[PDB]
């Protein structure tokens, strides 16, 4: 969810028109996943959250990416400095599960926003 | 119920003795009393507490006359005489 | 001493000597409570030590109470409690 | 007959610990020192668990008539100085070592107690909002 | 402004799912009227054991069951993500942006995300 | 946290009303005085001085307009 | 007049010093922030000093007025550290009220503080030192 | 600005007896009173433990305005002072140092002597002594009488 | 909100306060009268919890662990509930400070992990060293 922030905001300014408002808010909505894991784990928002943005966004003098793009959200529970590599614990997510969850979650919020009126009756 | 009228005065007298009981000795508990005029005074002396307490109860005012004679005759024990008085009332 | 001498009396007055001895133990009990010490624990230590010894230590601590204070405290309390129980009613008088 | 019934339960399991607050006091003191070497919020949390272990000797002294306030300060005095195995006498209140009186307690009780009590307490606090239906 | 209050009704159940995903998650004890206690950590199973009042809540429940039937995994990812899309859209309602272009914006952003997977 | 919300809503309630006082197209405003008169001008400096405020954060915003 | 006693007056002393401590809670240290005092007239003031706030602080309570004279005692002599004194005295009242359920006598609580106060001064005097580190290091430099 | 900076310097150097501030007085005394409370006892040990733990509120609330976490700073500060008093009476030390302070500007733990925060001893002694004088008069009131 | 956790803490306190005097062979006993009007008096901590029938869902956890303590072991049925409840009281003020329950759980599990190795060190088990199968008993 954090890595998709840099790619979606890049396409926001590329598409002209009023669609820029929905594209920017679409990438910000992915910040709830790292914030939920950091808040429930007792970690400070002013500490872990700014380190997550700097993990996937760095200044590299070159066109080819380098360093480590695999740094995720760490639960901690004992102690740590910054974040750690996810490839050490080999925690991955299948594409079939992630891709299917996007289309379902998109149509779920679409139905709620499309309904401006609700009619009910007592039984 | 001629005695129940007196029993109501005995219970009210034991409440005053229990309040002064906590102030006995140098380590006793002080009492805060705010006068109607706005003066705020505090001390552990039992004679000064009952003097500014302005007790409206007729029987409870007898402890003030005893405390006045306690300081005028012996000079000490104004707090202990209130506790000893309430002990006989409880028995 | 008054607890043992209470058997020498007879009738209703004999029971008063038993309650009068317990009414005198409130003064030493309050002194133990206001000092932070355990209430009942210090009172039990008083009856234990005063049996063998007599007035023995506050003398080393320089604590001396004159006898007239302890005498007037009982005398004034006897007249104060008497003036209370003798009032059987009160009414507005002016 | 009384001597056989005591060693009977000790034959099934030979792993025993010193009872009467002995073992409970030694654990509470060591966890305070081990927490001092652990940085972070876990330092004050471990110290809270050591204080929670004092409720076991408390109720034992209160139900027997002893004063839990005085026995707690008198035991800790001799606990941190010299011999750390000093326990609490069940009959007469006084300081003493349960190792001399040969008073033992099975260790399997404390092992399952510390595991069950800590887990059951952590499960209740693990949820922020509980929604339970009625019927 | 019921469209704003409709998000608040889901927000009450949003914090329930925020305590599910992650190692801090915990099962919820539910006592049925028949005298049977069902205890499970899965949030999709809990939705069947909860009484739904507002009919708009059932929309997210029906979408959550789709994740369990087909792929069987990611039920917490669907409900939490769908609840956050309503919070970011609430600011656009107060801003004056119509909900029609908001729906069209998600369709363009969804096709761009699938190509990057 | 309720005190931080009251501090924001105190200064914003004054700012949201004067939003129509900006620019040459600024719309006129009408205040209701106890006297039969009224303030027909759209000048923000004259309107803010006649508005009675309660929360002290709005009082600090009035002193800033006098210096500006 | 009315007369109260028991555990009700002990709970009022904690609630009285709680609102007073919250006034000096955010003003502690140089990192503190200013606050405003609004009276019935409608005027106010802006200051970052917690000592001047306690002088104009209006609180009706027997224990609350004690801290008023305590704040003026430190200002007329030292003039600094008044904010830290109120915070210390506020926590001592909250922890002492919790000992009521433990059947702890208040005089023992007071006696325990007087014995610890005299022994704490001796421990503080052991770590006191004059100006040092003049050669090889710098001390007064980082102050300015 | 030089006269204002000199004012802080001349007031500190006026008293030859100074003490490092920033929480060094309250934190170092908290651990010392833990083992010292056993030497007294007799129902007074519980009052000393609550008196020592009541001093941790000063560094706690101080870190609130600095946006730093008050739970981590107070906890980690006790860990450093723990090993500082272990080798102190032995008159020998290697990695153990005293006077650990709290710097909220840079967000790190450094000595307040080198950091530039110094306070006189007279100010600290009279502040702690007068704080307990008002606490005694409050706890001794069991009754409130108002006409 | 946070009121659900506070309601769960006070649920275990009301059950603990009844079981506090029951610790020890000389401790107090709890009397429970079932709707059948059958009065039973016993010092067993497991029998007392079975007759309470607490509606609070999280309070049944202390009853479930008490039945397993009396079955697989048989000793410590009352002490496991008091220890679990007293540990809950120490964590009550930690909620108002904003500390999440994640680090609270990891802090206690760290002490228990160090306690298992501590109990084995404190417990003295000897067989062929300065003892035998007889002199030991």
UniProtKB/Swiss-Prot annotation, chain C:
Which locations, inside or outside the cell, does it occupy?
A: Cytoplasm
List the signal peptide residues.
Answer: none
Q: What does this protein do?
A: Molecular chaperone; assists the folding of proteins upon ATP hydrolysis. Known to play a role, in vitro, in the folding of actin and tubulin. In yeast may play a role in mitotic spindle formation.
- Any miscellaneous information on file? Present with 5530 molecules/cell in log phase SD medium.
> Quaternary arrangement and interactors, per the entry?
Heterooligomeric complex of about 850 to 900 kDa that forms two stacked rings, 12 to 16 nm in diameter.
Q: Which family does it belong to?
A: Belongs to the TCP-1 chaperonin family.
Q: What is this protein called?
A: T-complex protein 1 subunit delta
In terms of the parent sequence, the fragment covers 424 to 528 of 528
Swiss-Prot record, chain D:
Query: What subcellular locations does the record give?
Result: Cytoplasm
Give the top-rank taxon of the lineage listed in the UniProt record for this protein. Eukaryota
User: Where are the disulfide bridges?
Assistant: none
Role: Molecular chaperone; assists the folding of proteins upon ATP hydrolysis. Known to play a role, in vitro, in the folding of actin and tubulin. In yeast may play a role in mitotic spindle formation.
Quaternary structure, per UniProt, is: Heterooligomeric complex of about 850 to 900 kDa that forms two stacked rings, 12 to 16 nm in diameter.
What does the sequence similarity comment in the record state about its family? Belongs to the TCP-1 chaperonin family.
The protein's name: T-complex protein 1 subunit eta
Organism the protein comes from: Saccharomyces cerevisiae (strain ATCC 204508 / S288c)
Q: Which residues of the full protein are shown?
A: 394 to 528 of 550
Curated annotation (Swiss-Prot), chain E:
Tree of life domain: Eukaryota
The cysteines covalently paired via disulfide bonds are none
Give the location in the cell. Answer: Cytoplasm
Describe its partners and assembly state: Heterooligomeric complex of about 850 to 900 kDa that forms two stacked rings, 12 to 16 nm in diameter.
The UniProt similarity line reads: Belongs to the TCP-1 chaperonin family.
Q: What does this protein do?
A: Molecular chaperone; assists the folding of proteins upon ATP hydrolysis. Known to play a role, in vitro, in the folding of actin and tubulin. In yeast may play a role in mitotic spindle formation.
Q: What is this protein called?
A: T-complex protein 1 subunit theta
What species is this protein from?
Answer: Saccharomyces cerevisiae (strain ATCC 204508 / S288c)
Placed within the complete protein, the shown segment runs 26 to 142 of 568
Curated annotation (Swiss-Prot), chain G:
Q: Where in the cell is it found?
A: Cytoplasm
Q: Where on the tree of life does the source sit, at the highest rank?
A: Eukaryota
- Changing residue 32 to E: what effect? Temperature-sensitive
**Oligomeric and partner information:** Heterooligomeric complex of about 850 to 900 kDa that forms two stacked rings, 12 to 16 nm in diameter.
What job does the chain carry out? Molecular chaperone; assists the folding of proteins upon ATP hydrolysis. Known to play a role, in vitro, in the folding of actin and tubulin. In yeast may play a role in mitotic spindle formation.
Please state which protein family the record places this protein in: Belongs to the TCP-1 chaperonin family.
Q: What is this protein called?
A: T-complex protein 1 subunit alpha
Native organism: Saccharomyces cerevisiae (strain ATCC 204508 / S288c)
Provide the gene name from the record.
TCP1
Q: Which residues of the full protein are shown?
A: 17 to 160 of 559
